[PDB]
Design a protein around this nucleic acid. Structure first.
Lengths: 411, 555
DNA sequence: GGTCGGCGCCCGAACAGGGACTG
DNA sequence: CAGTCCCTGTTCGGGCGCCG
């Protein structure tokens, strides 16, 4: 008996038409039980081939989670409804969420099933469940409530969400609450003990309205990865050549970098392994360049209208560096991740984990999901990435092949 | 017109479009008799109805022969209607392969006849399915009908039938969960582990459950005893094989003949291991005419004779056993070709296959092996829904050296090493540090965009030097040529310093094959070396001999 | 015959996007 | 400076096979 919020696509665009990719047996069995149960609860209903729209669907398990979770790749749909969740019902981003001692994520996706979806928009939420060896044709469904993973769902539920959070925000005014997709980010400066206690208070505060998760974060302990120069005592020709190329590449970010005196040491046609003593003018040029790399880049600031872009570099031995920017060489944040799951045995698992950790930090700091430039081939990525995904959202990505040149971000 | 028991599917036209209005083709008198004989029969059964001048739409119609039968099939040239009809989402996501079938006690195959003619069409949509049947006289106006059931030739007929058929089978599958029903268009593979007695009871239960909705299961197409003819295979209680494959024996081969031959070979490579189409597909490159005669090369005639000898022996696959693990083993067949077999017990192949794509201008065997594993993994999840264990002809240390040092993310699932030559290996290893006591080469190349002329050379620390004039070249080819010179005139251990990102980006990927002859010559020189260290310096910065050699090859 | 849909392959044409050089 | 040429990769379309 709830009124439906009318939703329309962006002008001059049709719904998503993305084919369903093959799914493993443990995933198809998980989707059949969930779709049958959701159909029994009236959340979804079967459709036919007269619906020309479709969206891929697969299942996941969150970190340390046994139950399967239905996930839809609404990325193509979210691109075609972008003016709705940014212009009309936009959610403000609290700048203090990243300054809290502890932030916890809660999967509130089960609450969207309480609000019905607009009748005219249900045509675009269509998806298909495949069968093993194509035993049967595609079993198709469509969403009758607010779908999990659609950017229009938290915008419609925002009015209902604020009224539920008002009794808790009044009792705890110093606690910051942000909502992005099917997740709820709660950050506070409380001690870790009473912090988790206030979480359980909100868990029961949400259970009495018709809604269980525990992932913790510590944004105050997030570090950046600056560009570092080696502290070598004996410099060879090859060492100075690599240093010049690295400093020359770093000059595109820090305009004050100079390599004039260091290039003067590479005047003769010397052997690479030959040791070269650093002149007095070169030792000062090396010390000044180290200090410039300590300085922050001039003129770098976040633009809310520009899209975020993240580049990842595999540096081997379980080391992965990343940079987030909107304009080239104007990087908003650099970093490095190490010893993640699958280190020294699986690159795809580490790359999948790295994309998740980067996207999580982007939601806390700016409230946006960046577009990734992944150092992997497409077919390699599109084959295994679903086997390691543990998040309810999915960022956009493209595939690059930039062979290394000099190692700018890792020593 | 009575109401069909099956629910109809609402179909619309694309907004801002009217129905088709196209003139009928001139038909042969033999096809006219077959059409009027069928049109009058389908009209009696309530499948097509007469229409008057109030229907301003029309579409062509013709008929082709049915395979191994005197009956004809009616088809409609709906090419103009399909353009203006709404888009449909096909529910046929793929193909049912016999390698995914599980061993069942009893098996029954049946095919319903004129199935498109047993499923109704949307009432508001029948007006656009108007067609004219020309009479034996060109002056006779002709009889105009409209379809009341799925027309053969319309782009929505298969998509509507496959979804309507699944809806009818859902109540039977819900009441009979342990019954496996492979549903592909108008063919039903019904198997069960029930006793042979209760099997035919459920078989007749389904033939009556399908009869309640207007679907007839004739006893002519009914199959109760093996071997079953299903999806172009021969299903036996323990093995399966494809129906007999016939290759053309043309004395004069056209492009069309080669295309048909390659297609049949691709179909055969599923169970017939060792099929190669490399040299036969090399006959289809750069050709323009489908009917152009092309002589067979010596490498193509040998490849055809080998494939003919493989098709002489009888091969057979087995069925999937979910209790034991899935195993896939790959062999390097030819330069750019790969073959694989998927099995659970030794020499009992579930199915075979091949992979041979050339991705990129420069690649190695490790890249191609990774591509094949991915092609097999996707194929396995389609059929069996799981990733098989791999037996790869690559050393555990060889792969460990590759993926750890490669800059891209690469990975292979759980696999073990099999010692079946030829073994995939890395042909040369670039050193990570400069080599002590090795001659250092500073190379560079340049060319002119207009003259297509340039130089390429090097300067060493021991005073060695060389510059070579080059004709009809580019800036990239010279910088590669400068490296090739440094590899020719150097000892077994050599340090090479370049400023070409393009040249360095190709060599560090450790390729063993390339479309460029200059790269293959560089690869050949790299294999002969013992220690090779590459390094990149920015050009035009006065670095070592890189500025000295940049000025020599300037023109 | 010159219908539709599904799936696979092999080829070329067309398109795309980055790197080094030039008015 | 923008505008190319060079190069390489992807996407798409058009053939053939197979099935219904």
């Amino acid at each position: 008996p709830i009124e439906t919020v009318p939703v329309k696509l962006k002008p001059g665009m049709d719904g998503p038409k993305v084919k369903q990719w093959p799914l493993t047996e443990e995933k198809i069995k998980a989707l059949v039980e969930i779709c049958t149960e959701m159909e029994k609860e009236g959340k979804i209903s079967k459709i036919g081939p007269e619906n020309p729209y479709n969206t891929p669907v697969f299942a996941i398990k969150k970190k340390d989670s046994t139950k399967w979770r239905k996930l839809v790749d609404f990325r193509e749909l979210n691109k075609r409804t972008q003016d709705f969740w940014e212009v009309q019902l936009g959610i403000p981003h609290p700048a203090g969420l990243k300054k809290k001692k502890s932030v916890t994520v809660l999967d509130v996706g089960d609450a969207y099933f309480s609000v019905p979806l607009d009748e005219d928009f249900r045509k675009y939420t269509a998806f298909t469940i495949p069968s093993i060896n194509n035993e049967t044709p595609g079993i198709r469904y469509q969403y009758n409530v607010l779908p999990q993973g659609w950017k229009g769902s938290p915008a419609i539920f925002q009015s209902s969400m604020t009224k539920i959070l008002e009794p808790f925000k009044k009792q705890n005014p110093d606690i910051v609450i942000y909502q992005y997709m099917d997740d709820l980010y709660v950050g506070s400066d409380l001690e870790i003990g009473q912090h988790r206690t206030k979480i359980e208070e909100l868990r029961q505060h949400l259970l009495r309205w018709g809604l269980w998760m525990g992932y913790e974060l510590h944004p105050d302990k997030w570090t950046v990865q600056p560009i570092v120069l080696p502290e070598k005592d004996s410099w060879t020709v090859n060492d100075i050549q690599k240093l010049v190329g690295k400093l020359n590449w770093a000059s595109q970010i820090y305009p004050g970098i100079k390599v004039r005196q260091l290039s003067k040491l590479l005047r003769g046609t010397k052997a690479l392994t030959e040791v070269i003593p650093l002149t007095e003018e070169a030792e000062l040029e090396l010390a000044e360049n180290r200090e410039i790399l300590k300085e922050p880049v001039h003129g770098v600031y976040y633009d809310p209208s520009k899209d975020l872009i993240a580049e990842i570099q595999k540096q081997g031995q379980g080391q992965w560096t990343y940079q987030i920017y909107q304009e080239p060489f104007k990087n908003l944040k650099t970093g490095k991740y190490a010893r993640m799951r699958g280190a020294h045995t699986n690159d795809v698992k580490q790359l999948t984990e790295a994309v998740q950790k980067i996207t999580t930090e982007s939601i806390v700091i700016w409230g946006k999901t960046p577009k990734f430039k992944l150092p992997i081939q497409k077919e390699t990525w599109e084959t295994w990435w679903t086997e390691y995904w543990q998040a309810t959202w999915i960022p956009e990505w493209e595939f690059v092949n930039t062979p290394p040149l000099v190692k700018l971000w890792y020593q | 017109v009575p109401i069909s028991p099956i629910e109809t599917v609402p179909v619309k036209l694309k907004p801002g479009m009217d129905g088709p209005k196209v003139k009928q083709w001139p038909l042969t008198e033999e096809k006219i008799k077959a059409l009027v004989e069928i049109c009058t029969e389908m009209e009696k059964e309530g499948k097509i109805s007469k229409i008057g001048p109030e229907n301003p739409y029309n579409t062509p119609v013709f008929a082709i022969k049915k395979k191994d039968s005197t009956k004809w099939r009616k088809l409609v040239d709906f090419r103009e209607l399909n353009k203006r009809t709404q888009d449909f989402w096909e529910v046929q996501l793929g193909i049912p392969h016999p390698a995914g079938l599980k061993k069942k006690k009893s098996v029954t195959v049946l095919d319903v006849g004129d199935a498109y003619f047993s499923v109704p069409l949307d009432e508001d949509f029948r007006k656009y399915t108007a067609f004219t049947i020309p009479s034996i006289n060109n002056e006779t106006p002709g009889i105009r009908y409209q379809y009341n059931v799925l027309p053969q030739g319309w782009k929505g007929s298969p998509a509507i039938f496959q979804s309507s058929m699944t809806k009818i089978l859902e109540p039977f599958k819900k009441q009979n969960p342990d019954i496996v029903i492979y549903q592909y268009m108008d063919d039903l593979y019904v198997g069960s582990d029930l006793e042979i007695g209760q099997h035919r009871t459920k078989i007749e239960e389904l033939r009556q459950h399908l009869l309640r909705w207007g679907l007839t299961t004739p006893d002519k197409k009914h199959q109760k005893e093996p071997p079953f003819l299903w999806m172009g295979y021969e299903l036996h209680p323990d093995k399966w094989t494809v129906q007999p494959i016939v290759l053309p024996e043309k004395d004069s081969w056209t492009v069309n003949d080669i295309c048909k031959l390659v297609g049949k070979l691709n179909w055969a490579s599923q169970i017939y291991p060792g099929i190669k189409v490399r040299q036969l597909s090399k006959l289809l490159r750069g050709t323009k005419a489908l009917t152009e005669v092309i002589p067979l090369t010596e490498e193509a005639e040998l490849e055809l004779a080998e494939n003919r000898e493989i098709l002489k022996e009888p091969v057979h696959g087995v069925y999937y056993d979910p209790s034991k693990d899935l195993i896939a083993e790959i062999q390097k067949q030819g330069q750019g070709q790969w073959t694989y077999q998927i099995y659970q017990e030794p020499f009992k192949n579930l199915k075979t296959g091949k992979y041979a794509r050339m991705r990129g201008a420069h690649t190695n065997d490790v890249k191609q092996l990774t591509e094949a594993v991915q092609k097999i993994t996707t194929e396995s999840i389609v059929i069996w829904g799981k990733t098989p264990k791999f037996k790869l002809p690559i050393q555990k240390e060889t792969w460990e050296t590759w993926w750890t040092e490669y800059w891209q993310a690469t990975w292979i699932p759980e696999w073990e090493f099999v010692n079946t030559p030829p073994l995939v290996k890395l042909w040369y290893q670039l050193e990570k540090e400069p080599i002590v006591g090795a001659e250092t080469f500073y190379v560079d190349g340049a060319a002119n965009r207009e003259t297509k002329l340039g130089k390429a050379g090097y300067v060493t620390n021991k005073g060695r030097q060389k510059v070579v004039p080059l004709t009809n070249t580019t800036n990239q080819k010279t910088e590669l040529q400068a490296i090739y010179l440094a590899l020719q005139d150097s000892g077994l251990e050599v340090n090479i310093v370049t400023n070409s990102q393009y040249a360095l980006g190709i060599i560090q990927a450790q390729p063993d094959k390339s479309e460029s002859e200059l790269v293959n010559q560089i690869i050949e020189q790299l294999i002969k070396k013992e220690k090779v260290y590459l390094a990149w310096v920015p050009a035009h910065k006065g670095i070592g001999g890189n500025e000295q050699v940049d000025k020599l090859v300037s023109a």
